[PDB]
Amino acid sequence: RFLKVKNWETDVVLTDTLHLKSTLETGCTEHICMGSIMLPVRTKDQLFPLAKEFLDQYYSSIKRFGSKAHMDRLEEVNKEIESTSTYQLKDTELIYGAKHAWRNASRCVGRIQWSKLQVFDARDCTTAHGMFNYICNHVKYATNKGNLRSAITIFPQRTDGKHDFRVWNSQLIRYAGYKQPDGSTLGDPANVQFTEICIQQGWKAPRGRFDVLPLLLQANGNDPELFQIPPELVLEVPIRHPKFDWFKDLGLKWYGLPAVSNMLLEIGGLEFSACPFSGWYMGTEIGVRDYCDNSRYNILEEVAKKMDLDMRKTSSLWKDQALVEINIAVLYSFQSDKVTIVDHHSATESFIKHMENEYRCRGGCPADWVWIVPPMSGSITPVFHQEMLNYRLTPSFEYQPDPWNTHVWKG
Amino acid sequence: RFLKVKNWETDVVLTDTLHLKSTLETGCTEHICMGSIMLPTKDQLFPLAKEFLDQYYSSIKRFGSKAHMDRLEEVNKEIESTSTYQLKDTELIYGAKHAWRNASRCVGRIQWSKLQVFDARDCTTAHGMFNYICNHVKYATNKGNLRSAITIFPQRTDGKHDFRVWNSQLIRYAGYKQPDGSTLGDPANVQFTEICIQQGWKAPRGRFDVLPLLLQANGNDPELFQIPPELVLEVPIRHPKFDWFKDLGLKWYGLPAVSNMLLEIGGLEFSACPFSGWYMGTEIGVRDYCDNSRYNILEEVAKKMDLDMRKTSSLWKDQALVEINIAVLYSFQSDKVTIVDHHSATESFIKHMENEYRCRGGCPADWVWIVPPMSGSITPVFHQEMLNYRLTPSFEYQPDPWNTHVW
Ligand code: HEM
Ligand code: HEM
Ligand SMILES: Cc1cc(N)nc(C[C@@H]2CNC[C@@H]2OCCNCC(F)(F)c2ccc(F)cc2)c1
Ligand SMILES: Cc1cc(N)nc(C[C@@H]2CNC[C@@H]2OCCNCC(F)(F)c2ccc(F)cc2)c1
Ligand SMILES: C[C@H](O)[C@H](O)[C@H]1CNc2nc(N)[nH]c(=O)c2N1
Ligand SMILES: C[C@H](O)[C@H](O)[C@H]1CNc2nc(N)[nH]c(=O)c2N1
Ligand SMILES: [Zn+2]
């Protein structure tokens, strides 16, 4: 069956046939839509079909579907599963899989880039120290002195789920949060709980507004260990505004490298529980969410205070006014320092072109509208007007619960 | 089956039970989500009638009583004999208020129960429709102190005698396409405007020409009526800081009045049921003024502000967007015409959600529509999870009549 999507600004109509390869469930039914819900040990039995399915896709992609090379590999994976209860991906399959998990990430507006991804194979890793070294190399390679390059590092897969590799940090680079006795927070309020564990684990906290957290790393199901990323590896940008000279005196900065470390990569039925990836920022992630969420740095009042805005009625749109200037500043600062960044206009336009190309080549592009639309100026970006179909393809990236709720402490 | 919704900013978690009384289908399956798609007999009628009267009698604390069982019989007999039935005034008022209560796409529902219902089921001609609508417009406008209202024309019968308002809103501006190649006025209404001219309208060919009503009574060919100019309250648009703003020549109308929708109460279809409240500023300032396919005035405003338009990363569109919206709000307030800003409206709606959760067991809500088209994440609705489902009585969208009329 065919499904259509309309763009209401252009009347372009696209046809989705790809949704027919979708296995996993959405959380939605014919009676309820859960499109805005943030969150809506394997057997031999269930593994070979998922392996088979994936290898069929891989072999099609490289135009060898049905070849002797394809059949032999099905055979070989077959045997490995019956004998060992799992299997190992060839390099070429890991690369392809990691790329396709990004291609299939419906919440990611950055996917025009999906085919340029540096895959770092770290399946030979055995210790947290080893993980640390692999992660440092990732950071240095991705950062590339401000000319950011997309990369992912893939640590060994789940075996019995008693031996998981996990990166406890939600991103490789993030600032500490310190809840004070008066109830105010110092630094990033999102990271308070994680900061507390780091400190409990022996970290000596500087206790300022922008202290880069230590990595907390779990290898082979062991208790995790602290490591400080070398500071010369952590590229940071001080935030200033092109016209407002007082902006720098707010004392803001942000890190250049967005690097998601808490997700689970699934390929051919195997689960990679530590697979930190990175690209570059869209300016709104920092300027809207990180700086302006009430539960984050929450700088709207102080910025509007300094801009002498009428702050006595919401209808002066003082919040909206300060929001734009902060986002101007973020982009200005990154650009002035030659750190890769993309504005939300450019990102969404690029994404619409990617989406259209995907419909032509692939028969679809799963997209989560709730996430794709930027969190400022929604309707002046072309994605606002774009109907999207959301569905789940594998390979995929999935959220996993924070590991401190699940970890069996060895002591 | 007991579903939770989380606010990610306040950590408030609410439990939804109301969705289990959901009746209609969303267009989502367990395989595909269609959350962002704009458009996803006597035997059939009696269960629909019963389900409604059951909720009605429960709402008046009279469920399963003498009066309840009696009405159910009477309606059953009327259906069996006549193939439809008629609502009591009380049922109609309740039906209408609830349709708005159930509108998951509507941010303003904190107001749902203050709805003035105008019963126009005794209407029989287009001229009568025009009279009823003028009266609605004047009552709702109220010299700027806007009051919510709906006017309900006769229900569908065999479907060949439908009442319809051909306009999508009671008050909208004309759109004309020029030899130039571009568009004069509102480009969303080009098609409607040509039909008007085609049926006889003497268009002034300006930028802001209030369209005539095209009213169809009892399935007949529709007819043109100009709304009395003195009944259409308009607002000239100025900026509190920018002198030059006024000279853009911008105005908007004070009364948002949706007139193309279909009201379903207890299985009965009211295909002409124009309703109105008051505007959230973003509807005009963001959508009407700034959509590429609408008046699209970002490019011209950015220029007057002397901003750097060379590159998208200067955020000139965004800068101009805010000031445009400051201007819409300032003007309406200065002219004493009811308007709400998106901060205030979304805050109220979170209050509304919590009342509905604790009082009703939920509140169906479509996040894609509730979050404003500017500054999403600084309004509290962005961070609020919502469950979208279809409750009845309801408003449903209907195809433009000119697609589906026998001329
Ligand atoms: C290259 C530049 C990239 C840009 C500009 C970009 C942009 C974004 C944005 C704005 C989001 C929304 C989520 C949020 O706002 O926190 C997102 C989500 C996501 N991206 Fe991308 N992204 C990029 C690269 C990548 C890469 C390299 C990968 C993986 C290989 C990736 C995978 C994902 C996934 C899995 C999500 C969902 C995240 C979650 O569920 O928390 N992205 N992206
Ligand atoms: C009183 C102030 C009101 C406010 C501030 C308000 C606000 C809104 C907004 C912002 C939307 C989004 C639709 C769009 O962007 O075009 C909407 C949709 C809607 N509203 Fe409300 N509204 C109000 C009154 C009413 C009333 C009186 C009714 C019915 C009696 C109603 C029923 C609906 C319906 C059915 C929709 C969806 C319309 C569609 O599908 O196109 N609203 N409203
Ligand atoms: C509950 C929950 C579920 C889920 N899937 N995810 C979360 C992380 C949230 C998403 N929103 C805020 C926070 O995630 C913040 C980090 N997100 C960065 C990114 F994914 F957008 C990204 C990745 C790579 C790039 F190169 C550029 C950007 C929470
Ligand atoms: C295709 C389609 C489907 C659908 N359901 N609807 C449409 C009208 C579009 C939707 N979105 C913008 C435009 O409709 C503009 C009119 N909307 C006004 C309102 F509904 F928001 C409203 C009603 C009463 C008030 F007091 C205040 C506001 C098109
Ligand atoms: C409740 C709602 O789904 C939630 O706040 C979402 C909305 N859209 C988002 N979009 C992005 N890119 N990132 C987010 O964290 C969110 N949060
Ligand atoms: C495709 C998408 O659903 C469409 O552009 C929607 C998005 N959200 C909206 N939200 C509101 N309030 N009104 C609209 O017209 C739209 N349009
Ligand atoms: Zn859905």
Q: In chain A, what are the domains?
A: 16-123+150-160+264-278+348-372 (3.90.340.10), 124-149+164-235+399-403 (3.90.440.10), 236-258+281-346 (3.90.1230.10)
Q: Would you call A32 and B26 a contact, using CB atoms and an 8 Å cutoff?
A: yes
SS3 label, residue B323: helix
SS3 label, residue B214: strand
Determine the Cα–Cα distance for residues B5 and B367; give it in Å rounded to an integer. Answer: 12
Distance from CA of A189 to the nearest CA of B (A): 11
The residue nearest atom 27 of ligand 1, judged by CA position, is: A279
What are the phi and psi torsion angles at A33 (to 5°)? -105, 130
The half-sphere exposure of B223 on its side-chain side, counting CA atoms within 13 A, is: 12
Number of residues that make up chain B: 407
The half-sphere exposure of B299 on its side-chain side, counting CA atoms within 13 A, is: 5
Q: Would you call A335 and B326 a contact, using CB atoms and an 8 Å cutoff?
A: no
Rg (CA), chain B: 23
Q: What is the SS3 string spanning chain A? A: CCEEEEECCCCCEEEECHHHHCCCCCCCCCCCECCCCCCCCCCHHHHHHHHHHHHHHHHHHCCCCCCHHHHHHHHHHHHHHHHHCCCCCCHHHHHHHHHHHHHCCCCCCCHHHCCCCEEEECCCCCCHHHHHHHHHHHHHHHHHHHCCCCEEEECCCCCCCCCCCEECCCECCCECEEECCCCCEEECHHHHHHHHHHHHCCCCCCCCCCCECCEEEECCCCCCEEECCCHHHCCEEECCCCCCHHHHHHCCEEECCCEECCEEEEECCEEECCCCEECCEEHHHHHHHHHHCCCCCCCHHHHHHHCCCCCCCHHHCHHHHHHHHHHHHHHHHHHHCCCCEECHHHHHHHHHHHHHHHHHHHCCCCCCHHHHCCCCCHHHCHHHHECCCECCCCCEEEECCCHHHCCCCCC
Is B359 annotated to bind a ligand? Reply is no
- In sequence order, which residues have a C-beta less than 8 Å from that of residue B241 and are 6 or more positions away? none
- CB-based contact B219:B160 (threshold 8 Å): yes
Determine the Cα–Cα distance for residues A291 and B339; give it in Å rounded to an integer. Answer: 29
Mutate which: A1, A33, A335, vs B, most B CBs within 10 A: A33
Residue whose token pair is 């700027």: B144
Contacts of A373 in chain B (CB under 8 A): 376
B309 reaches A (C-beta below 8 A):
no
Report how many helices (DSSP H) and strands (DSSP E) chain B contains, helices first: 11, 18
SS3 label, residue B263: strand
One of A103, A111, A166, A174 is an active-site residue; which one? A111
- In sequence order, which residues have a C-beta less than 8 Å from that of residue B133 and are 6 or more positions away? B151, B165, B170, B213, B215, B227, B274
Contacts of B27 in chain A (CB under 8 A): 30
Residue whose token pair is 């569905």: A391
| Largest interatomic CA distance in chain A | 74
- CB-based contact B366:A28 (threshold 8 Å): no
The half-sphere exposure of B122 on its side-chain side, counting CA atoms within 13 A, is: 5
The experimental method, as deposited, was X-ray
Q: Please note each residue after which chain A is broken, C-to-N distance over 2.5 A, or write none.
A: 40
What would the two tokens of residue B217 be? Answer: 């009574």
The residue nearest atom 17 of ligand 4, judged by CA position, is: B258
Q: Would you call A370 and B367 a contact, using CB atoms and an 8 Å cutoff?
A: yes
- CB-based contact A76:A68 (threshold 8 Å): no
Nearest to A269 by CA among A38, A116, A62, A58: A58
Please give the DSSP secondary-structure letter assigned to residue B374.
Answer: S
Determine the Cα–Cα distance for residues A288 and A326; give it in Å rounded to an integer. Answer: 8
In A, residues 326-385, which contact B (CB 8 Å cutoff)? 327-328, 331, 335, 343, 345-346, 368-370, 373-380, 384-385
Q: Would you call A323 and B31 a contact, using CB atoms and an 8 Å cutoff?
A: no
**Dihedral sign for Cα atoms in the order A241, A242, A243, A246:** positive
State the Cα angle at A45 between A40 and A47, rounded to 5°.
60
Look at strands B251-253 and B234-236 and give their pairing.
antiparallel
B175 strand-pairing partners: B185
Look at strands B183-185 and B394-397 and give their pairing.
unpaired
The verdict on whether A240 is a catalytic residue reads no
A398 strand-pairing partners: A264
Distance from CA of A378 to the nearest CA of B (A): 5
Nearest to B389 by CA among A7, A373, A5, A36: A36
The residue nearest atom 8 of ligand 4, judged by CA position, is: B168
Contacts of B387 in chain A (CB under 8 A): 32-34, 37
Residue whose token pair is 């529509």: B369
- CB-based contact A141:A149 (threshold 8 Å): yes
One of A108, A198, A275, A365 is an active-site residue; which one? A108
Determine the Cα–Cα distance for residues B380 and B342; give it in Å rounded to an integer. Answer: 10
Determine the Cα–Cα distance for residues A135 and A165; give it in Å rounded to an integer. Answer: 13
- In sequence order, which residues have a C-beta less than 8 Å from that of residue B379 and are 6 or more positions away? B342, B343, B346, B347, B371, B372
A301 reaches B (C-beta below 8 A):
no
- In sequence order, which residues have a C-beta less than 8 Å from that of residue A39 and are 6 or more positions away? A399
Q: Provide the residue type at B87 as one letter.
A: L
Determine the Cα–Cα distance for residues A343 and A286; give it in Å rounded to an integer. Answer: 11
Out of A25, A31, A374, closest to residue B31 by CB: A25
In A, residues 69-98, which contact B (CB 8 Å cutoff)? none
Look at strands B223-225 and B257-258 and give their pairing.
unpaired
**Residue of chain B nearest A341, judged by CA positions:** B313
Regarding the beta carbon of A39 and ligand 3, being less than 6 Å apart is answered yes
One of B100, B106, B166, B363 is an active-site residue; which one? B106
- CB-based contact B329:A317 (threshold 8 Å): yes
A267 strand-pairing partners: A270
Q: Which of A377, A379, A390 to mutate to test the pocket of ligand 6 (most atoms within 8 A of CB)?
A: A379
Look at strands A118-121 and A151-154 and give their pairing.
parallel
Determine the Cα–Cα distance for residues B288 and B373; give it in Å rounded to an integer. Answer: 11
Distance from CA of B135 to the nearest CA of A (A): 31
Determine the Cα–Cα distance for residues B194 and B134; give it in Å rounded to an integer. Answer: 23
Nearest to B109 by CA among B402, B379, B345: B345
